[PDB]
């Protein structure tokens, strides 16, 4: 109604979450200004599906969900509907019917250091693809061979989480990108997230 939506704490947080454990924050009962969210730079991307971004400043929604995580530059294309890859299949999955926006920007000045920043992780192996908006934070030994693993990281038995190596001299495709996925939902309840208008 009168309060302001805390989009600052989502887009401009000090440290983001790994893609395999992606963070979700519910936005409700507030007024949102979508023209001021992030710093638009040469590399930032703003991809909306099923909703016009030039109009949602005049739109109202029941609730808004903001999913934030850090992903390699080459893999930012995977945060879309109908995509495959290690990120879309195992870490984060948008449904083929997605009605929202995907905002991403380069963060090589924040999430990369001279020795290499290995605090961001991603899932490399999984026995099945993720359902849309499913999250998997399980550390369990992946069984690639026919023999069981029983929690042992030996041979054909791999630890599922690998580490992103973020160096400042990496190529654009290997540089860290911060991504925020906005989901705008409409229910039988009255709307609570409107723009200034």
């Amino acid at each position: 109604i009168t309060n302001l939506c805390p989009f600052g704490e989502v887009f401009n947080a000090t440290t983001f979450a790994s893609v395999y454990a992606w963070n979700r924050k519910r936005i409700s009962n507030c007024v949102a200004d979508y023209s001021v969210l992030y710093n638009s730079t040469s590399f930032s991307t703003f991809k909306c599906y099923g909703v016009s971004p030039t109009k949602l400043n005049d739109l109202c929604f029941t609730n808004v969900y903001a999913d934030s995580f850090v992903v390699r530059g080459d893999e930012v294309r995977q945060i879309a509907p109908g995509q495959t890859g290690k990120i879309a299949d195992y870490n984060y999955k948008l449904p083929d019917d997605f009605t929202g926006c995907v905002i991403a920007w380069n963060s090589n000045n924040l999430d990369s250091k001279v020795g290499g920043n290995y605090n961001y992780l991603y899932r490399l192996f999984r026995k099945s693809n993720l359902k849309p908006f499913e999250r998997d934070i399980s550390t369990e030994i992946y069984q690639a061979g026919s023999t069981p693993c029983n929690g042992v990281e030996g041979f054909n038995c791999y630890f599922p989480l690998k580490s992103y190596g973020f160096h400042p001299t990496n190529g654009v495709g290997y540089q860290p990108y911060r991504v925020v996925v906005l989901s705008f939902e409409l229910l039988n309840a009255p709307a609570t997230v409107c723009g200034p208008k």
């Binding site: 290499g116 490399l124 192996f125 992946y142 690639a144 061979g145 026919s146 041979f155 054909n156 791999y158 690998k162 580490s163 190596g165 160096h167 001299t169 990496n170 190529g171 654009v172 495709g173 290997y174």
Partner: protein, 596 residues
């Protein structure tokens, strides 16, 4: 659960773990080649050891997946490449000792300085101090000093290191089921398991020697013409039947006769095609040189250089603050990091060198989408050849007019073609015997056919016979003149530059045909021809996922190395040299020496 699915999963873990370990090794190696300190040698060996140890444990694990149960070809190729048990079959002491020898020779080459007998505190490095002398001096004694003092003060230091370097390298190769280290290097051209395209390691020596016979006529007439023009510059020092003095060629070793143009121009009254004077007159710098080469690759459809390239590359000598390896090299560090290390001067030789090293980066960026184990050249010859097929067009007077290094009213006649073809032959044809003779010496040293006392005896017996070059001062076994060259003291293979030259004209014949060029091959400029760049890019993107024999046929139509495009390129100059040598002797005597 199946062997193939276990291999795909195993390779997935390898690719994501080797990406960062290889990049850390490349970073530490870059901090040494640009900044030569003992501290940087420590970190280079550390990141290198952790990469070699990772390869050994992953190669051992890769052998537990039998290839006989892999229907997938690209997976079978990655496992096959990973199962080769590397340079870590030595003991810990011998591996750390071998790398110490390599590290010691590399520092000696790039930091070793000679001091003139007059001033004990005024010394000259090989770059820029002796390279400037060997390239711009016309005094016989000044060139004789720099040529000899470099091989006597620095070359003698490398002799005991190189002897132990041969012993350890053979042990590493013989532990790899190779007969010697020379056979190990020839394995880069080896192809097995492909019907109609298999190439053996011994087949390279046959094809190199057979193709070289078809090059001797063009070289012997170029040799006789240069020897005649050199007599007019060094009257009392050169014999019209003797070999050429090694210290009178364009550079320290005689690798390229490029700097001998000003002394061997056929028609000097015509506008000079050497753009070196024009580059200095227009106030060009190393930035402008690479930006122009960057613009040339874009004209054919290839991408700009990455933003990290312009920020992380070292395109000029850093000065006396930090000692660097000034030899022009290109770097594929991994994770999309591409750099070039070159102490660029404002000369045309460095202008074409920029096109050479950028050809590597352009080739690296092409197959970057391939899996990690397939991010390499089809063979070592392909890699050093990409930059040279661009230099063929970038050196033509037509392209030099468009960029503004020749006059806008320049003309193409009787005597500008011979001027251009002569310069191209000094660089391209001159290095063919120098390269073949140098690699054949190492092939025989590694094989054991040359004992340690005749090293310098057989080295100059082959210089006189094969290259037609004689030493100005007699050298005994205390000298190590092969090690005085970069590629020998820095553990690189040299036959890559022989196949490079023959490949670059087979490619140029196919690219000029795609550009619908009409006329001779030497007047072809593939500038602004996306059809030419596309035919080349379709081969660069494949990496080494396909054999070099098949990858070469898909572009030029030949399964093997060939000499016909090379001779066809220089045919207008070949008939002109045969007429200019009617009053000269074609050949050389292996007995004449400028000393007693």
């Amino acid at each position: 659960s199946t062997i193939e699915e276990q291999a795909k999963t195993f390779l997935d873990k390898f690719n994501h773990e080797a990406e960062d370990l290889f990049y850390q090794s490349s970073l530490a190696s870059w901090n040494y080649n640009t900044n030569i300190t003992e501290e940087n040698v420590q970190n280079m060996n550390n990141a290198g050891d952790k990469w070699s140890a990772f390869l050994k444990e992953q190669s051992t694990l890769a052998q537990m997946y039998p290839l006989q149960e892999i229907q997938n070809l690209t997976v079978k190729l990655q496992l096959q490449a990973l199962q080769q048990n590397g340079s870590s079959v030595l003991s810990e002491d011998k591996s750390k000792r071998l790398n110490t020898i390599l590290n010691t020779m590399s520092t000696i080459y790039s930091t070793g300085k000679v001091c003139n007998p007059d001033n004990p505190q005024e010394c000259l490095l090989l770059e820029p101090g002796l390279n400037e002398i060997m390239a711009n001096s016309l005094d016989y004694n000044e060139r004789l000093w720099a040529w000899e003092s470099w091989r006597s003060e620095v070359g003698k230091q490398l002799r005991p290191l190189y002897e132990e370097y041969v012993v350890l390298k053979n042990e590493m190769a013989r532990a790899n089921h190779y007969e010697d280290y020379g056979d190990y290097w020839r394995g880069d051209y080896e192809v097995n398991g492909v019907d109609g395209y298999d190439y053996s390691r011994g087949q390279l020596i046959e094809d190199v020697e057979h193709t070289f016979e078809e090059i001797k006529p063009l070289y012997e007439h170029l040799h006789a013409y240069v020897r005649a023009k050199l007599m007019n510059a060094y009257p009392s020092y050169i014999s019209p039947i003797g070999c050429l003095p090694a210290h009178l060629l364009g550079d320290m070793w005689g690798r390229f006769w490029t700097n001998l143009y000003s002394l061997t121009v056929p028609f000097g009254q015509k506008p000079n095609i050497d753009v070196t004077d024009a580059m200095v007159d227009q106030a060009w710098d190393a930035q402008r040189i690479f930006k122009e080469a960057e613009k040339f690759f874009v004209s054919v459809g290839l991408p700009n250089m990455t933003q990290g390239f312009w920020e992380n590359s070292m395109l000029t000598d850093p000065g006396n603050v930090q000692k660097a390896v000034c030899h022009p090299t290109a770097w594929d560090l991994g994770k999309g990091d591409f750099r070039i290390l070159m102490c660029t001067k404002v000369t045309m030789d460095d202008f074409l060198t920029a096109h050479h090293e950028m050809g590597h980066i352009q080739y690296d960026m092409a197959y970057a989408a391939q899996p990690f184990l397939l991010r390499n050249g089809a063979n070592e010859g392909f890699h050093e050849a990409v930059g040279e097929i661009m230099s063929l067009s970038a050196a033509t007077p037509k392209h030099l007019k468009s960029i503004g290094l020749l006059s806008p009213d320049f003309q193409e006649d009787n005597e500008t073609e011979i001027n251009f073809l002569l310069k191209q032959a000094l660089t391209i044809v001159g290095t063919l015997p120098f390269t073949y003779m140098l690699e054949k010496w190492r092939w025989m040293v590694f094989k054991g056919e040359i004992p340690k006392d005749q090293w310098m005896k057989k080295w100059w017996e082959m210089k006189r016979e094969i290259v037609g070059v004689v030493e100005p001062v007699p050298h005994d076994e205390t000298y190590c003149d092969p090690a005085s060259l970069f590629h020998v003291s820095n553990d690189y293979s040299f036959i890559r530059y022989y196949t490079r030259t023959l490949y670059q004209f087979q490619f140029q014949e196919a690219l000029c045909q795609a550009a619908k060029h009409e006329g001779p091959l030497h007047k072809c400029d593939i500038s602004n021809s996306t059809e030419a760049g596309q035919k080349l890019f379709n081969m660069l993107r494949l990496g080494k996922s396909e054999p070099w024999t098949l990858a070469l046929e898909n572009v030029v139509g030949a399964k093997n190395m060939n000499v016909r495009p090379l001779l066809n390129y220089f045919e207008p100059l070949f008939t002109w040299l045969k007429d200019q040598n009617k009053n000269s002797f074609v050949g050389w005597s292996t007995d004449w020496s400028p000393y007693a």
